[PDB]
């Protein structure tokens, strides 16, 4: 949504561009557009959704 996806090598995170501050990747700090076919160099990783555990209450 704002920031860059980054990885240390195995963990995936998102950060603001100008100071390393690794957040977990979520449906809040990201936005969707289209299917995985079109983008060059896209990577497979799980995006977390904070509502899920609350409906699992």
């Amino acid at each position: 949504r704002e920031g860059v996806f980054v990885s240390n090598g195995t963990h995936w995170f998102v950060t603001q561009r100008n100071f390393y501050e690794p957040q977990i990747i979520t449906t809040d700090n990201t936005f969707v557009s289209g299917n995985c076919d079109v983008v060059i160099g896209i990577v497979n990783n799980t995006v977390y959704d904070p509502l899920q555990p609350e409906l699992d209450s």
Partner: protein, 50 residues
């Protein structure tokens, strides 16, 4: 100097003009064709227009 992949530099040029970065990635081959073809017109412009 911080290295960054060129198609990610262009996404952060696009967000600066208010076009959302997914517009670049959904059109990256088209944008590369338009940019490469646009510099072709510079060589023709300078070669023709003394």
């Amino acid at each position: 100097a911080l290295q960054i992949p060129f198609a990610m530099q262009m996404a952060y040029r696009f967000n600066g003009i208010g076009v959302t970065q997914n517009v670049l990635y959904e059109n990256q081959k088209l944008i590369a064709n338009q940019f490469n073809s646009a510099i072709g017109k510079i060589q023709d412009s300078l070669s023709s227009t003394a």
